[PDB]
Amino acid sequence: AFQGMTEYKLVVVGAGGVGKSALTIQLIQNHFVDEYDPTIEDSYRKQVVIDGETCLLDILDTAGHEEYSAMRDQYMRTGEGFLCVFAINNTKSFEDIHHYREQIKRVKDSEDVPMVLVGNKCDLPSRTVDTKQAQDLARSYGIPFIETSAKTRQGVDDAFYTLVREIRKHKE
Ligand SMILES: COc1nc(-c2cccc3c2O[C@H](CNC(=O)C2CCOCC2)CO3)ccc1Nc1cccc(CN(C)C)c1
Ligand SMILES: Nc1nc2c(ncn2[C@@H]2O[C@H](COP(=O)(O)OP(=O)(O)NP(=O)(O)O)[C@@H](O)[C@H]2O)c(=O)[nH]1
Ligand SMILES: [Mg+2]
């Protein structure tokens, strides 16, 4: 029966420049990317142990704005869980979260899709989104909220591991 470790397909979504790539590269390479090189689509893989279970994370790092609609629908269909990322110094990115979540719910035709709300750049001083407002949004969705910094690494492992735990709860 066991043919190899369990694989989880994770998709990182959110507005341009919120730190999707930086979060992922911090997880994979333990490296902070200071440059802003806009992504088209990149795939990463990492084996980790979460709650005593070995797993392979297949992580799709997406473009903030994806014009080809058909490619976007494809990764939403294939993804098992979604990190919905905003930047705590960018109110507009926070307002956009609702739109990412709606699109995902429509493609998966479900109210109950594994997701984590991620407030990134929590190292920066010019916060415009209060922690309490983000926590309230996440509570309204029934999903976890995690504050992260791709720079300091605060919350980075937690965000990805929490998402895996959400997928597991959903599969059971
Ligand atoms: C392609 O398989 C993967 N898939 C995902 C993945 C995770 C979550 C959702 C996904 C994903 O890819 C899917 C594969 N893509 C598609 O089917 C595309 C093909 C072109 O038209 C549009 C659809 C789409 O949705 C993430 C990582 C990998 N793969 C990967 C990552 C890093 C390293 C390697 C190994 N390589 C460097 C030797 C493989
Ligand atoms: N101080 C700080 N800067 C960050 C953080 N995360 C990302 N950045 C910076 O924000 C800029 C954008 O990051 P990047 O990961 O490219 O964002 P993205 O969401 O992948 N953009 P795209 O959607 O175009 O692919 C980069 O200059 C990066 O260094 C963080 O937690 N703290
Ligand atoms: Mg990127």
Structure description:
The protein has 172 residues and is of the alpha/beta class. The protein has one domain (1-172): Rossmann fold. It is built from five helices and six strands, in the order βαββαβαβαβα. It has helices at residues 20-29, 69-78, 91-108, 131-141, 156-171, and strands at 6-14, 41-50, 53-62, 81-87, 115-120, 145-147. A six-stranded mixed β-sheet has the order 2-3-1-4-5-6, with helices on both faces. β5 (115-120), α4 and β6 (145-147) form a beta-alpha-beta unit. It is classed as oncoprotein. The entry lists the keywords Abd-4, inhibitor, kras, oncoprotein.
Please name the defining characteristics of this protein.
alpha/beta; Rossmann fold; six-stranded mixed sheet; 5 helices; binds ligand D1Z; binds phosphoaminophosphonic acid-guanylate ester; binds magnesium ion; lipoprotein; cell membrane
How would you summarize what this structure contains?
This protein has helices at residues 20-29, 69-78, 91-108, 131-141, 156-171, and strands at residues 6-14, 41-50, 53-62, 81-87, 115-120, 145-147. The chain is of the alpha/beta class.
Number of helices: 5
The N- to C-terminal Cα distance equals: 18 Å
Strand order of the largest sheet: 2-3-1-4-5-6
Topology order in helix (H) and strand (E) letters: EHEEHEHEHEH
CATH topology: Rossmann fold
SSE map:
Blueprint: E1 6-14, H1 20-29, E2 41-50, E3 53-62, H2 69-78, E4 81-87, H3 91-108, E5 115-120, H4 131-141, E6 145-147, H5 156-171
Parallel strand pairs: 1-3, 1-4, 4-5, 5-6
Antiparallel strand pairs: 2-3
The protein binds the ligand COc1nc(-c2cccc3c2O[C@H](CNC(=O)C2CCOCC2)CO3)ccc1Nc1cccc(CN(C)C)c1, phosphoaminophosphonic acid-guanylate ester (GNP) and magnesium ion.
Modified residues (N6-acetyllysine): 108
Protein name: GTPase KRas
Modified residues (N-acetylmethionine): 5
